């Protein structure tokens, strides 16, 4: 009763906004003491004035919502021993005095009143090896030439967060001879903003050579670059929403369950899914997986992909999950969604 009185007093003292039905529920408990220990109809009257007041106000009109009522139980809640009590409550769903008080209280009316008051042999073959940061150029120039045939010309350049940086000096195409020409590239510097690389490159026709290869690269992609990276979930969510929204791609379709499939993709991009809730990536799950990664030149990229997941006549051998990609530029970001899309499955490149 001390608590009850206090509550009433504080309530009176306040009035200026809030929301709780939930609170009501919170004080009550499964059972609890109320009144003397019982005052029956009068007690029904007791429930009626204290609750009615809360209600009277409730009945009144609104500005911003406070919470749309779902007090269905609210109704039982107001109205062998336990069984008897329950029955009494159902029926309901000193006493006279209480009722009168409630009527008097009946608080929209009060609010309204207040308002009123206010108012060639040489064959060169080459491929790229990227061996640890360093994208390194395997070149075979094989000069199966009939001599250290004269060779042309080559030019240096700033590159991206890399710069190409070596040339084996000579320019002979030694006869019938095979050579390893190495280009180190410098892998942390040279900005060139020609995205995805794909920048024109020259090997020149400048000496025992009339032509050569001028090439633009292709073969320079993302899935690799980014490393996994991590976050606190609440903050995350907040952030997730917050981030560069602007890219998404869809997951749907494969060859596997997202157990093996997910693992594969994860490893392929070298990137993070931040946290599980056991709900269950198994029986279905009906799991949305949140992924985060940070790269070599430091972009953080955020995902929520929400996905169906394999399992007999339950669901998942497609997805129809949406991969939501946030990366700062949409252009790389979406492209990433693609890139991953490439990554997603396993087929003839």
């Amino acid at each position: 009763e001390d608590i009850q009185s206090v509550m009433t007093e504080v309530r009176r003292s306040l009035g200026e906004i809030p929301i709780v039905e939930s609170e009501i529920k919170k004080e009550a408990g499964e059972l609890k003491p109320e009144e003397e220990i019982t005052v029956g109809p009068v007690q029904k009257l007791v429930t009626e004035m204290g609750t009615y007041a809360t209600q009277s106000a409730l009945s009144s009109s609104r500005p911003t919502k406070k919470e749309e009522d779902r007090p269905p139980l609210r109704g039982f809640l107001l109205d062998v021993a336990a069984s008897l009590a329950t029955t009494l409550t159902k029926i309901a769903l000193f006493v006279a005095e209480a009722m009168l008080l409630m009527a008097t209280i009946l608080d929209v009316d009060r609010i309204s009143l207040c308002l009123k008051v206010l108012s060639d042999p040489v064959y060169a073959e080459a491929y790229v090896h990227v061996n640890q940061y360093d994208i390194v150029l395997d070149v075979l120039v094989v000069n199966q030439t009939s001599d250290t045939l004269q060779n042309c010309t080559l030019e240096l350049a700033t590159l991206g967060d890399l710069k190409l940086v070596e040339k084996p000096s000579p320019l002979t195409l030694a006869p019938h001879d095979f050579a390893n020409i190495k280009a180190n590239v410098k892998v942390a510097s040279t900005e060139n903003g020609i995205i995805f690389g794909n920048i024109v490159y020259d090997v020149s026709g400048a000496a025992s050579d009339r032509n050569c290869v001028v090439l633009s690269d292709i073969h320079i992609d993302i899935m690799d670059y980014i490393q996994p990276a991590t976050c606190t979930d609440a903050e995350f969510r907040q952030m997730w929403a917050e981030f560069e929204w602007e890219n998404k791609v869809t997951v749907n379709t494969n060859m596997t369950d997202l157990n093996d499939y997910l693992q594969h993709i994860l490893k392929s991009t070298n990137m993070k899914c931040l946290t599980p809730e056991k709900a269950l990536s198994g029986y279905c799950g009906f799991m949305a997986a949140n992924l985060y990664a940070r790269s070599i030149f430091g972009e953080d990229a955020l995902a929520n992909v929400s996905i169906e997941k394999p399992v007999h006549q339950g669901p998942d051998a497609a997805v129809t999950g949406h991969i939501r990609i946030r990366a700062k530029s949409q252009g790389m970001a979406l492209s990433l969604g693609d890139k991953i899309n490439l990554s997603q499955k396993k087929t003839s490149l």
Partner: protein, 798 residues
Amino acid sequence: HLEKSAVLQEARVFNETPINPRKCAHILTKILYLINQGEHLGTTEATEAFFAMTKLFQSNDPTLRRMCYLTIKEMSCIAEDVIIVTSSLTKDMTGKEDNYRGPAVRALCQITDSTMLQAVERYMKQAIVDKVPSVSSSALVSSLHLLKCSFDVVKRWVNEAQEAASSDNIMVQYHALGLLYHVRKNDRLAVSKMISKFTRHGLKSPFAYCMMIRVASKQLEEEDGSRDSPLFDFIESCLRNKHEMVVYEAASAIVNLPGCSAKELAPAVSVLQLFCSSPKAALRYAAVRTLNKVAMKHPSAVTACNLDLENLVTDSNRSIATLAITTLLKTGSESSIDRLMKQISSFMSEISDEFKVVVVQAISALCQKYPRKHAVLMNFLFTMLREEGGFEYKRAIVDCIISIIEENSESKETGLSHLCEFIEDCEFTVLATRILHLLGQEGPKTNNPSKYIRFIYNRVVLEHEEVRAGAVSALAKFGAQNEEMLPSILVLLKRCVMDDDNEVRDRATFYLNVLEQKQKALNAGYILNAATRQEIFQEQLAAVPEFQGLGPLFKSSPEPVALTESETEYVIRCTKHTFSDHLVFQFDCTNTLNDQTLENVTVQMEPTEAYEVLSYVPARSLPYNQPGTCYTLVALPTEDPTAVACTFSCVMKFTVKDCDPNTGEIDEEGYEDEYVLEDLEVTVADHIQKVMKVNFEAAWDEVGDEFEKEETFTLSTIKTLEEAVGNIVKFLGMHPCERSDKVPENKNTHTLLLAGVFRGGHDILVRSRLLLLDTVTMQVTARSSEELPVDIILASVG
């Protein structure tokens, strides 16, 4: 700025005689300004002001005469005395400063009272009527506010009154008529003979025409009779002149064609449409929306494309922007063009006269013509909607979603698919609330569980205890129902997905706890949430106890009869009820005139073809527009030849009492007059249940056996049943039979061997062998299980 104070003090200026009209006028002006801008104040001060002002009035200082008018003018339905001038009004009245006179009267009239009303009157009469058009106008306006109050004082004068309204100035002529808006409010008949006056003369004021139109129109809806010539007459009249408004006015209503009028009218209209078609009358926009309605007829529609294309094209003129949406809509569109438009719209919608609002209206229409239906469009639209966006879609969404529900759309899988996805990355929490609520109900009646789950999880995914919360609540209707896999799992899931975060913890715990608390099946349930028709009338009648026999009702009336014709003061509709023993006529009504309440009411009936007359019953009191009951009662003789079909003669008696409806009086005195009471005729269908026989073969013959009367006619000028037919199916209300009913729009021979049972229990049976040789000669039999019916049928059928 404004403020009262300087002025009240400043009232001592009144004390000077050396003043300039200007000087004072300004001061006067200052007060008026505060007020024109707005002021509020005490009467006392106002009164004072009056006095103070009033005080000044030696002169005819003309200017002075006006200002006061204003001043006074300020006061009219919320005044302060009247009397003071009085003299001054009269002074004008004998006094030729014509000019002035008129303004003053005009103010008075909101302010008025009845005694004082008495005042003007002989003169007044003159005055309204008097001289130069100018003066007269001044007079008129004055009443109207008094009309607010009343005006009937005037009213009375009327047979005599109108005639002066006869006019010779256009402006005036127009004016006369509105007063006639209320005049015609008072009366319809009057118009009609009147119109022939309005109709009679060609008119002056375009303005005058207009009120008539509305009226004229108003009249037309159910039909304004044989508007053919009038309509026509009019039709020119609206149609051309030097004053545009009429043509248009006419145009918008008049279409008429779902397989209907389109004749001249479409061309004329076209002349107009086109003519308007660039903001002549920026009016044109509204019309297409309804005023001039469109939903077309098929070739007709194709023709429409060009005009809409001009607006569609132009993209300008607020009047234009609106026009684009209605025209396009009404006429409808091909898919293809939409496409072009989507881009156009892409730029347009934001502001292009502030396109968004017209568009939201347009959009509201879009949601309606396709509210999740042509879902492909809905999706195309959806993509586009979100896309073209701004943000302003959200508002639209409120409508759109609503539309989808209205259909209760079925390409939801897709529809939903777009919604779900987009909304996710088309944001706004608020939308979610609404949709949630709806979704909340819907669940497993539309399956696709994995997806739906798939979604649901996502919806929650978002933070907000609140966002999260909805997925659970929606779920309750859903869970409970379960779907293509759910109950087991349904049970498994709440477990699999669980949360802390205190009150968020609590939400999980509690729902659980709640769950914990009821047998989940129960849990779900609580939380989630003869002696005919006519016999009834025999009983309904029964609450009364003044009876002199009844019985149980057998059949009731084949037709209720209005016993007082159309819309009469004592409007009566009557219904007649038959029982095995008695017949009651219970009388349904609306003692019409508010003139009257009828009192001392009883109903006379006087009979020709038998009934024993027990009583005439009337209603004790009948006030206006309110059924009350009066009855008249008879006992029905059944075995006599000629004894239950009857016509009874009616006379209404009452003591007639006048009303005050405001607050009445009900007093013992008042005097009778009696008015004719309509006939009641009693039928052979108020009493009968039409049937099929218990034993036709036998019965058929049998009924002959005991019962049978005959009549023969030989038909020599007409060889058709049909006349006969009209009287027989319809009079008796029985079934034509022995598979001997049917006739197409012709037939060689016919028998109705026909059925039902008469009141008092026994039956009345008829065989009509109609025989065509090629004259008709025919055998009508009535056979009956009751004596009174055989004689009767032969008559009754007629």
